[PDB]
Design a protein around this ligand. Sequence first.
Ligand SMILES: Nc1ncnc2c1ncn2[C@@H]1O[C@H](COP(=O)(O)OP(=O)(O)O)[C@@H](O)[C@H]1O
Ligand SMILES: Nc1ncnc2c1ncn2[C@@H]1O[C@H](COP(=O)(O)OP(=O)(O)O)[C@@H](O)[C@H]1O
Ligand SMILES: COc1ccc(-c2nnn[nH]2)cc1
Ligand SMILES: COc1ccc(-c2nnn[nH]2)cc1
Ligand SMILES: COc1ccc(-c2nnn[nH]2)cc1
Ligand SMILES: COc1ccc(-c2nnn[nH]2)cc1
Ligand SMILES: COc1ccc(-c2nnn[nH]2)cc1
Ligand SMILES: COc1ccc(-c2nnn[nH]2)cc1
Ligand SMILES: [K+]
Ligand SMILES: [K+]
Ligand SMILES: [Mg+2]
Ligand SMILES: [Mg+2]
Lengths: 325, 325
Amino acid sequence: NQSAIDVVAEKPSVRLTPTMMLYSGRSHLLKSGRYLQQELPVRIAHRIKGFRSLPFIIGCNPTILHVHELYIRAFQKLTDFPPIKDQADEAQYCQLVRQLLDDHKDVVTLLAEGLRESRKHIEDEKLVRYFLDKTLTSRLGIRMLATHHLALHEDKPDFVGIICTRLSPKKIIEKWVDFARRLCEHKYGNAPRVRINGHVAARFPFIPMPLDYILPELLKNAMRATMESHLDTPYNVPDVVITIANNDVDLIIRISDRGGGIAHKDLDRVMDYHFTTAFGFGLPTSRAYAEYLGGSLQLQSLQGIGTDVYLRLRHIDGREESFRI
Amino acid sequence: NQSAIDVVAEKPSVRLTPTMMLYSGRSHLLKSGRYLQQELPVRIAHRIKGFRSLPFIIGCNPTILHVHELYIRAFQKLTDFPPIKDQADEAQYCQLVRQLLDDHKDVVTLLAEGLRESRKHIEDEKLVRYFLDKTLTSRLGIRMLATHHLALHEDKPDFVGIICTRLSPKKIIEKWVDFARRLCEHKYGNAPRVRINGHVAARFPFIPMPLDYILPELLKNAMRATMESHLDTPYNVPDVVITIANNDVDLIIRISDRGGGIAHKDLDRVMDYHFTTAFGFGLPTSRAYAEYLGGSLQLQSLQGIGTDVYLRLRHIDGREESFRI
Ligand SMILES: Nc1ncnc2c1ncn2[C@@H]1O[C@H](COP(=O)(O)OP(=O)(O)O)[C@@H](O)[C@H]1O
Ligand SMILES: Nc1ncnc2c1ncn2[C@@H]1O[C@H](COP(=O)(O)OP(=O)(O)O)[C@@H](O)[C@H]1O
Ligand SMILES: COc1ccc(-c2nnn[nH]2)cc1
Ligand SMILES: COc1ccc(-c2nnn[nH]2)cc1
Ligand SMILES: COc1ccc(-c2nnn[nH]2)cc1
Ligand SMILES: COc1ccc(-c2nnn[nH]2)cc1
Ligand SMILES: COc1ccc(-c2nnn[nH]2)cc1
Ligand SMILES: COc1ccc(-c2nnn[nH]2)cc1
Ligand SMILES: [K+]
Ligand SMILES: [K+]
Ligand SMILES: [Mg+2]
Ligand SMILES: [Mg+2]
């Protein structure tokens, strides 16, 4: 809790849209590196401010305290590093960014553990939701900016940093379907087949990074629900049907399962952090990530039949607003 | 605007649940007839109060004024009729009920016309929504009570008045699919095939009367959208898929079309009364009817693909609350 953190804790974020980054990703690495150097300490200070504002009994949890202390250590490193003048200065910063990206890889796990240890002192799940939605999405934003900058140094086909210039939703969904079906097959001996329909030929600019979190979570929920509701017929289960709708405004991905649905008693709890019928972070984090990206995650439960999950995400066309929750 | 209307205009409604009516539908016609005689003038007075509360410029529309005057005439008839003592008194009342049911058959049409003539003097569509939602659902309630009482005199198989003791959602949906496909075929030369899945064998107590309004409206929307989006391939159109989910709490009917979806610009207008892309009452009346019955009507639009409409209705099991909006 030093005075340097206090100076930028209330300072507004200078937000850049993926379009702005795509135009620079066409001298431009120096302007980009300068932005990160000045903007990342502000984002880290906003996270520290969040920990400072937690109720005392929650902030005292040594696991919560440890994540708070990790963010203070990251602010110290980001500010104590000298400014960027030449290209070798921009390159020295990339190495610090690589190190901080790895030191904070398990923050969400530690935060879930801290939340769990403090369950008896909560009483307001809406306040837990605001803290975690803001912390995890601001963390997503920091990781996206940091990873994009590292990836700008590379000349990877169909990528401008972490922006895929021709992302196919069908291919990204197919990659995670194969990943999910294998885990499900190892647990139940079988997995539902996944059919993909709609705008299967869609290709457009998109950052796959948040879809790499959302898609396995939603597929795992759909497949586990399907298997749990058909234990008496486990080698003859209904397919999971994924429809892609692509238009000028947004991308919609509907994941429809025949997994029995979300019961009426659980319906208002599934979106709370740590609520589970088996981690409990899959749905509320996916919803927060979709909101951060200018979209949404909505559920329609048909109790006794199955669930329809709608993931809506905005395009990158020079019309989109900046990412924020 | 007489003093007799003033006496009961603020008097709370004495609400009966369909379970209460089903137990009586097992001496019981006199107790039922007594209820209608004392309760219907109160419901009519609540409608008059609604017309009295309309903004002056709207209430002045001679078409709105005419519906207001029709309700005053109905209150006069309901109160000026003598009380029910013997069974022939209960039977004399049935004839007045039959006559009033017919004199008000076109109220919604006149109200739509009055709303249309006053479009330039509205400015608040949320206030139009509250008036019409309340007027049309209270009207639904009056018609349901009046029709149920007439139908109690008959011994119709699987019916206790207007309560079907073993309503099959598949059969009622099939009846209206045949009705809708014929209108659609006469307009476009072809109609989408309707497939029904889910709990196709479900049978339970239910009042079909509101489903007889909601189902043709939703089917017409699904079929018109499908044809309008496939004009270049009109004899090869995608099916409309209806799923039935029945559980202890509610009945869910999902109507999924491949009709291109509800555009982003129209999405917040489709639920307004008189909004249409071709009457404009189908969706907002269906939503109000579903809410009145303890359920809901929700839409999920996949722009460029189609729409999923979810109609949720509560069961009649001795646990349901009374109908109200
Ligand atoms: N498709 C679905 N069908 C049925 N239940 C579901 C579905 N998706 C999620 N759920 C329910 O919501 C709960 C919370 O899900 P989630 O937040 O992703 O956490 P986790 O997957 O670790 O349980 C699940 O435990 C399950 O009860
Ligand atoms: N399934 C659907 N797919 C696409 N558009 C729809 C669908 N259902 C309704 N709409 C849109 O919503 C508007 C309002 O519908 P509605 O209130 O039922 O009135 P109406 O049927 O007389 O036009 C329609 O005119 C149409 O533009
Ligand atoms: C300077 O670059 C970074 C990148 C990532 C984090 C982070 N990830 N999770 N929590 N903090 C912190 C700093
Ligand atoms: C461990 O994570 C949390 C986050 C937030 C709260 C909170 N905010 N307001 N009241 N309780 C409690 C626990
Ligand atoms: C690759 O392009 C971008 C652009 C913007 C962000 C961002 N801004 N705020 N949080 N994340 C992340 C990546
Ligand atoms: C006494 O029975 C009735 C039945 C129906 C109405 C009605 N329908 N629409 N508007 N008023 C009025 C009275
Ligand atoms: C013709 O139908 C109506 C109903 C209600 C209003 C209203 N209520 N409040 N402000 N305008 C206007 C017109
Ligand atoms: C056949 O059983 C019933 C029960 C209740 C109503 C009602 N109450 N209020 N409005 N409609 C209508 C019919
Ligand atoms: K959860
Ligand atoms: K409408
Ligand atoms: Mg999950
Ligand atoms: Mg209609």
